[PDB]
Symmetry: C2
Subunit: 146 residues, 2 copies
Amino acid sequence: PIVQNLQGQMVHQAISPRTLNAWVKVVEEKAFSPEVIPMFSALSEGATPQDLNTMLNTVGGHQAAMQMLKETINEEAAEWDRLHPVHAGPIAPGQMREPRGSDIAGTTSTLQEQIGWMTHNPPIPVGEIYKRWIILGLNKIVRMYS
Amino acid sequence: PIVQNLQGQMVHQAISPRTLNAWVKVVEEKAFSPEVIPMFSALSEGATPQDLNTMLNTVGGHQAAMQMLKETINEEAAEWDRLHPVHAGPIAPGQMREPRGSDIAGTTSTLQEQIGWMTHNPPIPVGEIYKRWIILGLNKIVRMYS
Ligand SMILES: COCCN/C=C1/C(=O)N(C)c2ccc(C(F)(F)F)cc2N(c2ccccc2)C1=O
Ligand SMILES: COCCN/C=C1/C(=O)N(C)c2ccc(C(F)(F)F)cc2N(c2ccccc2)C1=O
Ligand code: NA
Ligand code: NA
């Protein structure tokens, strides 16, 4: 997630491995449990898409449940593009481009571009947007158990 | 916890009731379980003493376990005073005073004074210090189950 250092700068701070390890243990004990969702949202506060994917990849899960999660994310990303089309073409070096669904999901964006959108004014909270997509998918999983 | 708003300012953001509710459910299911500790540290990122006490009070627990926790905190606070004595007496209005153990524990300090120490340069991370005392006590509890 993003936090301000001892100067003023908004810097990225990776998620602690000990937090990740404890989290996977929680999910393992409360598989498909609704209470895990508010906890997921709590631990991902200020998280960038990169951080979110690290959490998702670390947890893993059932092949099938991961599918519904990915499909949900993909569906929401395509819905973002349908509503927020981005222009392709000429852009000067260092110019900020508008994020597409795949950028919000961290697939086609770097940590630096994610931080840029998140610390911009007006900000494009790509971390918050992606988290919502994930939570939608998690809420879908709990309701099928697959 | 403290977070920067849409201007630049370091503002306080209370813990979500939904997070608190989910957390108490976790502790209830994993009573005295070591894995809860890394999770406690994760959710209290950037937390002020006020936030920490809200979490502690919300969780509650066994009369006896709460005792060892309080006694541990009290013991560490007295140890902080023994090593970092603070001068009493004349101080101008609005002057920043050095925190004593009771201030770090949020007993004799306001949310505003806690934020002041935490956003000062060099900072007095009262939230981090208090969190360590709590985690020491939690590690004590797990090892007695009381
Ligand atoms: C470590 O795996 C052990 C067995 N549990 C697997 C699960 C699963 O298959 N998926 C795909 C995932 C993926 C990410 C997460 C996340 F960390 F993000 F929360 C939870 C989660 N949930 C889940 C979903 C909804 C509500 C509660 C838990 C599971 O139970
Ligand atoms: C809601 O209560 C249901 C039964 N569990 C009670 C417990 C207890 O009596 N105390 C005093 C506390 C107090 C705060 C916390 C905190 F939220 F901060 F983690 C955990 C905790 N732990 C605890 C201690 C060490 C490791 C894991 C859990 C307990 O089990
Ligand atoms: Na990437
Ligand atoms: Na207070």
